[PDB]
Amino acid sequence: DKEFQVLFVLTILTLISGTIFYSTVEGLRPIDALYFSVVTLTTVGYGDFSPQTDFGKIFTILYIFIGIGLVFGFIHKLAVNVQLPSILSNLVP
Amino acid sequence: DKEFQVLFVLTILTLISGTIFYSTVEGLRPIDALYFSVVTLTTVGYGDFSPQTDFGKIFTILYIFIGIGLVFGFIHKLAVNVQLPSILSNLVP
Amino acid sequence: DKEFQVLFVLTILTLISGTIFYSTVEGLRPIDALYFSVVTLTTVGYGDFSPQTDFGKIFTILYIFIGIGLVFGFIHKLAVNVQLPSILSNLVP
Amino acid sequence: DKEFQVLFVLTILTLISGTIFYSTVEGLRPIDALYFSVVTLTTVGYGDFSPQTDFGKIFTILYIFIGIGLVFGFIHKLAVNVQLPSILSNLVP
Ligand SMILES: [K+]
Ligand SMILES: [K+]
Ligand SMILES: [K+]
Ligand SMILES: [K+]
Ligand SMILES: [K+]
């Protein structure tokens, strides 16, 4: 429970950093920066948005390496410690 | 066995939600909406389709976080509890 | 060892199916079809190639769900049962 | 600790190979080649860069299969043996 809260906060902070960075350096609207940060760290990578500056490319390399781990950690705990219990409870005959 | 059936249903429901959402808000043909939902949740992300509206971008963020876990859960069980047994049986000398 | 050989063969067969399908239905050159199949099943998804026909989109949905599991199974075993031993042996003082 | 250092070095070497290959065969600037190599091995795959030559497509297939395992191995150890301890220490009441 507290573990999920910590990953939640960590993920939020990571996404906030990405939103601030891409909106500033890559000139994206804040919503697009947040959306791009999520699409990046979850490894979907549509490419509708991508860094055009070298500063952006370098940050993206570091952002991915440092963010993928926590984002997927949060996703795992969300599905196993939150979603799983709910589906099971919806079964209880 | 029953576990696989539950993940199967859950995945179907998740994909149906995506199909309805993207066909309505993003104006995609139903087949393209389903295809896009799958390409998104499996993290392939070709980008041949991507949300153009803010409503679509926000939903996509939430859809990914909530759907990746179950989709990959189903994929895992499919390969370990269904595909694996079959390949092994095809070996039995 | 034999496990790695089985996953190797399974991966080859899966990629051959994709190569045949995309070169025929989507009209790609065989090399591009193989390349696209790999980029798809490893979830990279550049999007330089993507299915344009409904037949192709439907097959892609099924191909991903059935192929991701085995492809990543092979990748895991390759890194743990082949690459890992080699790096360790290159260390042995 | 030493495990993390080995994966660190291995990842560096893998990325250096990609940087050299794509800058030479695909004609990318070194920074773009490094960026593309990272985007590829972490499976993000934006597609802003992608191999245009057959030599590049073939290398990419092999690069992905051999590199994804080590890159994600490093990411895992980075998050579990480096990031995790730090966040926990930042909690210690
Ligand atoms: K991807
Ligand atoms: K991916
Ligand atoms: K992608
Ligand atoms: K494009
Ligand atoms: K893409």
CSV table of C-alpha atoms and ligand atoms in Angstrom, one decimal:
chain,number,residue,atom,x,y,z
A,1,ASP,CA,0.0,0.0,0.0
A,2,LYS,CA,2.6,2.5,1.1
A,3,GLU,CA,4.9,1.0,-1.6
A,4,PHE,CA,2.3,1.9,-4.2
A,5,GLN,CA,2.0,5.4,-2.9
A,6,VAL,CA,5.8,5.9,-3.1
A,7,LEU,CA,6.0,4.7,-6.7
A,8,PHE,CA,3.0,6.8,-7.5
A,9,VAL,CA,4.7,9.9,-6.2
A,10,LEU,CA,8.0,9.0,-7.9
A,11,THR,CA,6.2,8.5,-11.2
A,12,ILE,CA,4.5,11.8,-10.8
A,13,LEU,CA,7.8,13.6,-10.1
A,14,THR,CA,9.4,11.9,-13.1
A,15,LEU,CA,6.6,12.9,-15.4
A,16,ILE,CA,6.6,16.5,-14.0
A,17,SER,CA,10.4,16.8,-14.9
A,18,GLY,CA,9.7,15.6,-18.4
A,19,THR,CA,6.8,18.0,-18.8
A,20,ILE,CA,8.9,20.9,-17.7
A,21,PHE,CA,11.9,19.9,-19.8
A,22,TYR,CA,10.1,19.2,-23.1
A,23,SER,CA,7.8,22.2,-22.9
A,24,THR,CA,10.8,24.5,-22.3
A,25,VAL,CA,13.6,23.0,-24.5
A,26,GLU,CA,11.5,21.4,-27.2
A,27,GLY,CA,8.8,24.0,-27.1
A,28,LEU,CA,5.9,21.7,-26.6
A,29,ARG,CA,2.6,22.7,-25.0
A,30,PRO,CA,2.6,21.3,-21.4
A,31,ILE,CA,-0.1,18.7,-22.2
A,32,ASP,CA,1.9,17.5,-25.2
A,33,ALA,CA,5.1,17.4,-23.1
A,34,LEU,CA,3.3,15.2,-20.5
A,35,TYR,CA,1.8,13.0,-23.1
A,36,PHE,CA,5.2,12.6,-24.9
A,37,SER,CA,6.9,11.9,-21.6
A,38,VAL,CA,4.4,9.1,-20.8
A,39,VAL,CA,4.6,7.7,-24.4
A,40,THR,CA,8.4,7.7,-24.0
A,41,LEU,CA,8.8,6.1,-20.6
A,42,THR,CA,6.2,3.3,-21.2
A,43,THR,CA,8.2,2.6,-24.4
A,44,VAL,CA,5.3,3.0,-26.8
A,45,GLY,CA,7.1,5.7,-28.8
A,46,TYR,CA,4.6,6.8,-31.5
A,47,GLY,CA,7.0,9.4,-32.8
A,48,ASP,CA,4.2,12.0,-33.3
A,49,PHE,CA,6.5,14.0,-31.0
A,50,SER,CA,10.3,13.5,-30.7
A,51,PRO,CA,13.2,15.7,-29.6
A,52,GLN,CA,14.6,17.9,-32.4
A,53,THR,CA,17.4,19.6,-30.5
A,54,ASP,CA,20.6,17.9,-29.4
A,55,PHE,CA,19.9,19.0,-25.8
A,56,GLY,CA,16.6,17.2,-26.1
A,57,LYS,CA,18.1,14.1,-27.6
A,58,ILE,CA,20.7,13.9,-24.8
A,59,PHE,CA,18.1,14.4,-22.1
A,60,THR,CA,15.9,11.8,-23.7
A,61,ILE,CA,18.7,9.2,-23.5
A,62,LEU,CA,19.2,9.8,-19.8
A,63,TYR,CA,15.4,10.2,-19.1
A,64,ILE,CA,14.7,6.8,-20.6
A,65,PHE,CA,17.4,5.0,-18.7
A,66,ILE,CA,16.4,6.5,-15.4
A,67,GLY,CA,12.7,6.6,-15.9
A,68,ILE,CA,11.7,3.3,-17.5
A,69,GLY,CA,12.6,1.4,-14.3
A,70,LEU,CA,10.4,3.3,-12.0
A,71,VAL,CA,7.5,3.7,-14.4
A,72,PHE,CA,7.4,0.0,-15.0
A,73,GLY,CA,7.8,-0.6,-11.3
A,74,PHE,CA,4.7,1.5,-10.7
A,75,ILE,CA,2.8,-0.3,-13.5
A,76,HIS,CA,3.7,-3.7,-12.0
A,77,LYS,CA,2.6,-2.8,-8.5
A,78,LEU,CA,-0.6,-1.1,-9.8
A,79,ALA,CA,-1.6,-4.3,-11.6
A,80,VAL,CA,-0.6,-6.7,-8.9
A,81,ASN,CA,-1.4,-4.8,-5.7
A,82,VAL,CA,-4.4,-2.8,-6.9
A,83,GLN,CA,-6.0,-4.1,-10.1
A,84,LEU,CA,-5.6,-7.8,-9.2
A,85,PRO,CA,-7.3,-7.6,-5.8
A,86,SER,CA,-10.2,-5.7,-7.4
A,87,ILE,CA,-10.8,-8.2,-10.2
A,88,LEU,CA,-10.7,-11.1,-7.7
A,89,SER,CA,-13.2,-9.4,-5.3
A,90,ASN,CA,-15.5,-9.0,-8.3
A,91,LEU,CA,-15.5,-12.7,-8.6
A,92,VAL,CA,-16.2,-13.8,-5.0
A,93,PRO,CA,-19.3,-16.0,-5.4
B,1,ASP,CA,-7.0,-22.4,-17.1
B,2,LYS,CA,-9.7,-20.3,-15.5
B,3,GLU,CA,-6.9,-17.7,-14.9
B,4,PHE,CA,-6.3,-17.5,-18.7
B,5,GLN,CA,-10.0,-17.2,-19.3
B,6,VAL,CA,-10.3,-14.2,-16.9
B,7,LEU,CA,-7.3,-12.4,-18.5
B,8,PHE,CA,-8.8,-13.2,-21.9
B,9,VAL,CA,-12.0,-11.5,-21.0
B,10,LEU,CA,-10.3,-8.6,-19.2
B,11,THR,CA,-8.2,-8.0,-22.3
B,12,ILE,CA,-11.2,-8.1,-24.6
B,13,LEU,CA,-13.0,-5.6,-22.4
B,14,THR,CA,-10.0,-3.3,-22.4
B,15,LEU,CA,-9.7,-3.5,-26.1
B,16,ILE,CA,-13.4,-2.9,-26.6
B,17,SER,CA,-13.1,0.3,-24.5
B,18,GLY,CA,-10.3,1.5,-26.6
B,19,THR,CA,-12.1,0.7,-29.8
B,20,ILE,CA,-15.2,2.7,-28.7
B,21,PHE,CA,-13.1,5.6,-27.5
B,22,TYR,CA,-10.8,6.1,-30.4
B,23,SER,CA,-13.5,5.5,-33.0
B,24,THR,CA,-15.7,8.2,-31.3
B,25,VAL,CA,-13.3,10.9,-30.1
B,26,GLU,CA,-10.5,10.4,-32.6
B,27,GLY,CA,-12.8,9.5,-35.5
B,28,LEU,CA,-11.1,6.2,-36.5
B,29,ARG,CA,-12.9,3.4,-38.2
B,30,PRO,CA,-13.6,0.7,-35.6
B,31,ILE,CA,-11.0,-1.7,-37.1
B,32,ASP,CA,-8.4,1.0,-37.0
B,33,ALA,CA,-9.4,1.9,-33.4
B,34,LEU,CA,-9.0,-1.8,-32.3
B,35,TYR,CA,-5.7,-2.1,-34.2
B,36,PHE,CA,-4.4,1.2,-32.6
B,37,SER,CA,-5.5,0.1,-29.2
B,38,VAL,CA,-3.5,-3.2,-29.5
B,39,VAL,CA,-0.5,-1.5,-31.0
B,40,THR,CA,-0.6,0.9,-28.1
B,41,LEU,CA,-1.0,-1.5,-25.2
B,42,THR,CA,1.6,-4.0,-26.5
B,43,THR,CA,3.9,-0.9,-26.6
B,44,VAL,CA,4.7,-1.4,-30.3
B,45,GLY,CA,3.6,2.2,-31.1
B,46,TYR,CA,4.1,2.5,-34.9
B,47,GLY,CA,2.6,5.9,-34.9
B,48,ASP,CA,0.6,5.4,-38.1
B,49,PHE,CA,-2.3,6.3,-35.8
B,50,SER,CA,-1.9,8.6,-32.8
B,51,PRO,CA,-4.3,10.8,-30.8
B,52,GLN,CA,-4.7,14.3,-32.3
B,53,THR,CA,-7.1,15.8,-29.7
B,54,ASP,CA,-6.2,16.7,-26.1
B,55,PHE,CA,-9.1,14.4,-24.9
B,56,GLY,CA,-7.4,11.6,-26.8
B,57,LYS,CA,-4.0,12.3,-25.4
B,58,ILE,CA,-5.2,12.4,-21.9
B,59,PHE,CA,-7.2,9.2,-22.3
B,60,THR,CA,-4.2,7.5,-23.9
B,61,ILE,CA,-2.0,8.3,-20.9
B,62,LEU,CA,-4.5,6.7,-18.6
B,63,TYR,CA,-5.3,3.8,-21.0
B,64,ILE,CA,-1.6,2.9,-21.2
B,65,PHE,CA,-1.0,2.9,-17.4
B,66,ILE,CA,-4.1,0.8,-16.8
B,67,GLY,CA,-3.9,-1.5,-19.8
B,68,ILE,CA,-0.3,-2.4,-20.2
B,69,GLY,CA,-0.3,-4.5,-17.0
B,70,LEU,CA,-3.3,-6.7,-17.9
B,71,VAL,CA,-2.4,-7.0,-21.6
B,72,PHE,CA,1.1,-8.3,-20.7
B,73,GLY,CA,-0.3,-10.4,-18.0
B,74,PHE,CA,-2.5,-12.1,-20.6
B,75,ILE,CA,0.4,-12.5,-23.0
B,76,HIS,CA,2.5,-14.1,-20.3
B,77,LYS,CA,-0.1,-16.6,-19.3
B,78,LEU,CA,-0.9,-17.3,-23.0
B,79,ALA,CA,2.8,-18.2,-23.6
B,80,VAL,CA,3.4,-20.1,-20.4
B,81,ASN,CA,0.0,-21.8,-19.8
B,82,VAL,CA,-1.1,-22.4,-23.4
B,83,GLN,CA,1.8,-22.1,-26.0
B,84,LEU,CA,4.4,-23.8,-23.8
B,85,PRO,CA,2.4,-27.0,-23.1
B,86,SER,CA,1.6,-27.3,-26.8
B,87,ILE,CA,5.2,-27.0,-28.0
B,88,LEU,CA,6.3,-29.5,-25.4
B,89,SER,CA,3.6,-32.0,-26.5
B,90,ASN,CA,4.8,-31.7,-30.1
B,91,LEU,CA,8.1,-32.9,-28.8
B,92,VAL,CA,7.1,-36.0,-26.9
B,93,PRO,CA,9.1,-38.8,-28.6
C,1,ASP,CA,21.0,-25.7,-24.3
C,2,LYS,CA,18.3,-27.7,-26.0
C,3,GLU,CA,15.8,-25.2,-24.6
C,4,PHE,CA,17.7,-22.4,-26.5
C,5,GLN,CA,17.7,-24.4,-29.7
C,6,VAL,CA,13.9,-24.9,-29.5
C,7,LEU,CA,13.3,-21.2,-28.9
C,8,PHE,CA,15.7,-20.4,-31.7
C,9,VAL,CA,13.7,-22.6,-34.1
C,10,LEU,CA,10.4,-21.3,-32.9
C,11,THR,CA,11.5,-17.7,-33.4
C,12,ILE,CA,12.8,-18.5,-36.9
C,13,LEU,CA,9.4,-20.1,-37.8
C,14,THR,CA,7.5,-17.1,-36.4
C,15,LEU,CA,9.7,-14.7,-38.4
C,16,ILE,CA,9.4,-16.7,-41.5
C,17,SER,CA,5.6,-16.6,-41.2
C,18,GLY,CA,5.7,-12.8,-40.9
C,19,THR,CA,8.1,-12.5,-43.8
C,20,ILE,CA,5.8,-14.5,-46.0
C,21,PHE,CA,2.6,-12.7,-44.9
C,22,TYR,CA,3.8,-9.1,-45.2
C,23,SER,CA,5.7,-9.6,-48.5
C,24,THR,CA,2.5,-11.1,-50.0
C,25,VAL,CA,-0.4,-9.1,-48.4
C,26,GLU,CA,1.4,-5.8,-47.8
C,27,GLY,CA,3.6,-6.1,-50.8
C,28,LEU,CA,6.9,-5.6,-49.0
C,29,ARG,CA,10.2,-6.9,-50.3
C,30,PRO,CA,11.1,-10.0,-48.3
C,31,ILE,CA,14.0,-8.3,-46.5
C,32,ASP,CA,11.7,-5.4,-45.5
C,33,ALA,CA,9.0,-8.0,-44.4
C,34,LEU,CA,11.5,-9.8,-42.1
C,35,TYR,CA,12.9,-6.5,-40.8
C,36,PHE,CA,9.3,-5.3,-40.1
C,37,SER,CA,8.4,-8.5,-38.4
C,38,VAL,CA,11.3,-8.2,-36.1
C,39,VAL,CA,10.7,-4.6,-35.3
C,40,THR,CA,7.1,-5.5,-34.5
C,41,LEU,CA,7.6,-8.5,-32.3
C,42,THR,CA,10.5,-6.9,-30.3
C,43,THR,CA,8.0,-4.0,-29.8
C,44,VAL,CA,10.4,-1.4,-31.2
C,45,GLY,CA,7.8,-0.3,-33.8
C,46,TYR,CA,9.5,2.5,-35.7
C,47,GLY,CA,6.6,2.8,-38.1
C,48,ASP,CA,8.7,3.2,-41.2
C,49,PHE,CA,6.7,0.2,-42.3
C,50,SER,CA,3.1,-0.6,-41.0
C,51,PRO,CA,0.2,-2.5,-42.4
C,52,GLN,CA,-2.0,-0.6,-44.8
C,53,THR,CA,-4.7,-3.2,-45.5
C,54,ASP,CA,-7.3,-4.4,-43.1
C,55,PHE,CA,-6.1,-8.0,-43.6
C,56,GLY,CA,-2.7,-6.8,-42.6
C,57,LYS,CA,-4.0,-4.9,-39.5
C,58,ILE,CA,-5.9,-8.0,-38.3
C,59,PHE,CA,-3.0,-10.3,-38.8
C,60,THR,CA,-0.7,-7.9,-37.0
C,61,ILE,CA,-3.0,-7.9,-34.0
C,62,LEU,CA,-2.8,-11.7,-33.8
C,63,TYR,CA,0.8,-11.9,-34.8
C,64,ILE,CA,1.8,-9.6,-31.9
C,65,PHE,CA,-0.2,-11.4,-29.2
C,66,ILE,CA,1.2,-14.8,-30.3
C,67,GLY,CA,4.7,-13.8,-31.2
C,68,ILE,CA,5.8,-11.4,-28.5
C,69,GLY,CA,5.8,-14.1,-25.9
C,70,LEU,CA,8.1,-16.5,-27.8
C,71,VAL,CA,10.4,-13.7,-29.1
C,72,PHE,CA,11.0,-12.3,-25.7
C,73,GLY,CA,11.4,-15.9,-24.3
C,74,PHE,CA,14.2,-16.5,-26.8
C,75,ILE,CA,15.8,-13.1,-26.0
C,76,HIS,CA,15.8,-13.9,-22.3
C,77,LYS,CA,17.3,-17.4,-22.7
C,78,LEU,CA,19.9,-15.9,-25.2
C,79,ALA,CA,21.0,-13.4,-22.6
C,80,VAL,CA,20.9,-15.6,-19.6
C,81,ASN,CA,22.0,-19.0,-21.0
C,82,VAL,CA,24.4,-17.8,-23.8
C,83,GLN,CA,25.5,-14.2,-23.3
C,84,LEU,CA,25.9,-14.3,-19.5
C,85,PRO,CA,28.2,-17.4,-19.5
C,86,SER,CA,30.4,-15.8,-22.1
C,87,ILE,CA,30.9,-12.5,-20.3
C,88,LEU,CA,31.6,-14.3,-17.0
C,89,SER,CA,34.2,-16.5,-18.7
C,90,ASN,CA,35.9,-13.4,-20.2
C,91,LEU,CA,36.3,-12.3,-16.5
C,92,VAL,CA,37.9,-15.4,-15.0
C,93,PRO,CA,41.2,-14.0,-13.6
D,1,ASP,CA,28.0,-3.3,-7.2
D,2,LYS,CA,30.6,-4.9,-9.4
D,3,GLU,CA,27.7,-6.4,-11.3
D,4,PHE,CA,26.3,-3.0,-12.0
D,5,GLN,CA,29.7,-1.8,-13.2
D,6,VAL,CA,30.0,-4.8,-15.6
D,7,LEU,CA,26.5,-4.1,-17.1
D,8,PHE,CA,27.4,-0.4,-17.3
D,9,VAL,CA,30.5,-1.2,-19.4
D,10,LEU,CA,28.7,-3.7,-21.5
D,11,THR,CA,25.9,-1.2,-22.3
D,12,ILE,CA,28.5,1.5,-23.1
D,13,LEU,CA,30.3,-0.9,-25.5
D,14,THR,CA,27.0,-1.9,-27.1
D,15,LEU,CA,26.0,1.7,-27.6
D,16,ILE,CA,29.4,2.6,-29.0
D,17,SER,CA,29.1,-0.1,-31.6
D,18,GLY,CA,25.7,1.2,-32.6
D,19,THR,CA,27.0,4.8,-32.8
D,20,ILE,CA,29.8,3.8,-35.1
D,21,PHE,CA,27.7,1.6,-37.3
D,22,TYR,CA,24.8,4.0,-37.9
D,23,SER,CA,27.0,7.0,-38.3
D,24,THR,CA,29.0,5.2,-41.0
D,25,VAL,CA,26.5,3.0,-42.9
D,26,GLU,CA,23.4,5.1,-42.3
D,27,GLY,CA,25.2,8.5,-42.4
D,28,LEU,CA,23.9,9.8,-39.2
D,29,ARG,CA,25.7,12.4,-37.1
D,30,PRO,CA,27.3,10.6,-34.1
D,31,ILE,CA,24.9,12.1,-31.6
D,32,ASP,CA,21.9,11.0,-33.7
D,33,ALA,CA,23.5,7.6,-34.1
D,34,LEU,CA,23.9,7.2,-30.3
D,35,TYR,CA,20.4,8.6,-29.7
D,36,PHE,CA,18.9,6.2,-32.3
D,37,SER,CA,20.8,3.2,-30.8
D,38,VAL,CA,19.3,4.0,-27.4
D,39,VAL,CA,15.8,4.6,-28.7
D,40,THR,CA,16.1,1.3,-30.5
D,41,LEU,CA,17.5,-1.0,-27.7
D,42,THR,CA,15.1,0.4,-25.1
D,43,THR,CA,12.3,-0.5,-27.6
D,44,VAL,CA,10.9,3.1,-27.6
D,45,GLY,CA,11.3,3.3,-31.4
D,46,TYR,CA,10.1,6.8,-32.3
D,47,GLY,CA,11.0,6.3,-36.0
D,48,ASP,CA,12.3,9.8,-36.4
D,49,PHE,CA,15.4,7.8,-37.4
D,50,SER,CA,15.3,4.3,-39.0
D,51,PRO,CA,17.7,2.4,-41.2
D,52,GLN,CA,17.2,3.1,-45.0
D,53,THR,CA,19.8,0.6,-46.3
D,54,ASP,CA,19.5,-3.2,-46.4
D,55,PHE,CA,22.9,-3.4,-44.5
D,56,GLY,CA,21.3,-1.2,-41.9
D,57,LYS,CA,18.1,-3.2,-41.6
D,58,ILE,CA,20.0,-6.5,-41.3
D,59,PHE,CA,22.4,-5.1,-38.6
D,60,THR,CA,19.3,-3.6,-36.8
D,61,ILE,CA,17.7,-7.0,-36.6
D,62,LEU,CA,20.8,-8.5,-35.0
D,63,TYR,CA,21.5,-5.5,-32.9
D,64,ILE,CA,18.1,-5.6,-31.3
D,65,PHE,CA,18.2,-9.4,-30.5
D,66,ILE,CA,21.7,-9.1,-29.0
D,67,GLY,CA,21.3,-5.7,-27.3
D,68,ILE,CA,17.8,-5.6,-25.7
D,69,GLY,CA,18.8,-8.3,-23.2
D,70,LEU,CA,21.8,-6.5,-21.8
D,71,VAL,CA,20.3,-3.0,-22.0
D,72,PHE,CA,17.3,-4.1,-20.0
D,73,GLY,CA,19.5,-6.1,-17.7
D,74,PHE,CA,21.4,-2.9,-16.9
D,75,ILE,CA,18.2,-0.9,-16.5
D,76,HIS,CA,16.9,-3.5,-14.0
D,77,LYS,CA,20.0,-3.5,-11.9
D,78,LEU,CA,20.2,0.3,-12.0
D,79,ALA,CA,16.7,0.6,-10.6
D,80,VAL,CA,17.0,-2.2,-8.1
D,81,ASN,CA,20.6,-1.9,-6.9
D,82,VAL,CA,21.1,1.8,-7.2
D,83,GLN,CA,17.8,3.8,-7.4
D,84,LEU,CA,15.9,1.7,-4.9
D,85,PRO,CA,18.5,2.0,-2.1
D,86,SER,CA,18.6,5.8,-2.6
D,87,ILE,CA,14.8,6.3,-2.4
D,88,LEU,CA,14.6,4.2,0.7
D,89,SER,CA,17.5,6.1,2.4
D,90,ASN,CA,15.6,9.3,1.6
D,91,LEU,CA,12.8,7.9,3.7
D,92,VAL,CA,14.6,6.8,6.8
D,93,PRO,CA,12.8,8.8,9.6
E,1,K,K,7.8,0.9,-29.0
E,2,K,K,8.2,-1.3,-26.4
E,3,K,K,7.4,2.8,-31.4
E,4,K,K,6.1,9.3,-39.3
E,5,K,K,7.0,5.0,-34.1
